[PDB]
Amino acid sequence: GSSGSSGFKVRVGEPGQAGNPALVSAYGTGLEGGTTGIQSEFFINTTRAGPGTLSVTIEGPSKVKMDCQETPEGYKVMYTPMAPGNYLISVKYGGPNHIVGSPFKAKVTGQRLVSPGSANETSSI
């Protein structure tokens, strides 16, 4: 009996790492939809791109408390909407060039929440 051999000899013809905004990926449960009253979060794949700087902006008819934490995988973003409507999430990296998939157009449903408030402060003027 006998057999043959098979290997692979190739040289690195690439720089390896290079400012690539496209490589940047985003996924989670917040992008799935807009849940008024629930806190959603999504991970930002920045391992292939690099430790480079990043930016995250959210628009809409009703502002939202945006949060950002330092993670070993990239950057975590948590936002909880209070009012329904059309929201937009921009993701920039390296420069003004946006990443693949963006902008993100998520639709938020479920009438606003109910809570005792709407109190006007004194000396409004």
Swiss-Prot record:
Phosphoserine: residues bearing it: 102, 115, 118
Post-translational modification as stated in the protein's UniProt record: ISGylation prevents ability to interact with the upstream activators of the JNK cascade and inhibits IFNA-induced JNK signaling. Ubiquitination by a SCF-like complex containing ASB2 isoform 1 leads to proteasomal degradation which promotes muscle differentiation.
Ranges occupied by Filamin repeats: 16-108
Glycyl lysine isopeptide (Lys-Gly) (interchain with G-Cter in ISG15), cross-linked positions: 105
Tissue: Ubiquitous. Isoform 1 and isoform 2 are expressed in placenta, bone marrow, brain, umbilical vein endothelial cells (HUVEC), retina and skeletal muscle. Isoform 1 is predominantly expressed in prostate, uterus, liver, thyroid, stomach, lymph node, small intestine, spleen, skeletal muscle, kidney, placenta, pancreas, heart, lung, platelets, endothelial cells, megakaryocytic and erythroleukemic cell lines. Isoform 2 is predominantly expressed in spinal cord, platelet and Daudi cells.
Annotated disorder: Interaction with FLNA may compensate for dysfunctional FLNA homodimer in the periventricular nodular heterotopia (PVNH) disorder. Atelosteogenesis 1: A lethal chondrodysplasia characterized by distal hypoplasia of the humeri and femurs, hypoplasia of the mid-thoracic spine, occasionally complete lack of ossification of single hand bones, and the finding in cartilage of multiple degenerated chondrocytes which are encapsulated in fibrous tissue.
Family note: Belongs to the filamin family.
Subunit structure of this chain's protein: Homodimer. Interacts with MICALL2. Interacts with RFLNA and RFLNB. Isoform 1 interacts with FBLP1, FLNA, FLNC, GP1BA, INPPL1, ITGB1A, PSEN1 and PSEN2. Isoform 3 interacts with ITGB1A, ITGB1D, ITGB3 and ITGB6. Interacts with MYOT and MYOZ1. Interacts with HBV capsid protein. Interacts with ASB2 isoform 1; the interaction targets FLNB for proteasomal degradation.
Functional summary from the UniProt entry: Connects cell membrane constituents to the actin cytoskeleton. May promote orthogonal branching of actin filaments and links actin filaments to membrane glycoproteins. Anchors various transmembrane proteins to the actin cytoskeleton. Interaction with FLNA may allow neuroblast migration from the ventricular zone into the cortical plate. Various interactions and localizations of isoforms affect myotube morphology and myogenesis. Isoform 6 accelerates muscle differentiation in vitro.
Description of its domains: Comprised of a NH2-terminal actin-binding domain, 24 internally homologous repeats and two hinge regions. Repeat 24 and the second hinge domain are important for dimer formation. The first hinge region prevents binding to ITGA and ITGB subunits.
Protein name in the entry: Filamin-B
Species, as recorded: Homo sapiens (Human)
Residues of the whole record sequence present: 2371 to 2488 of 2602
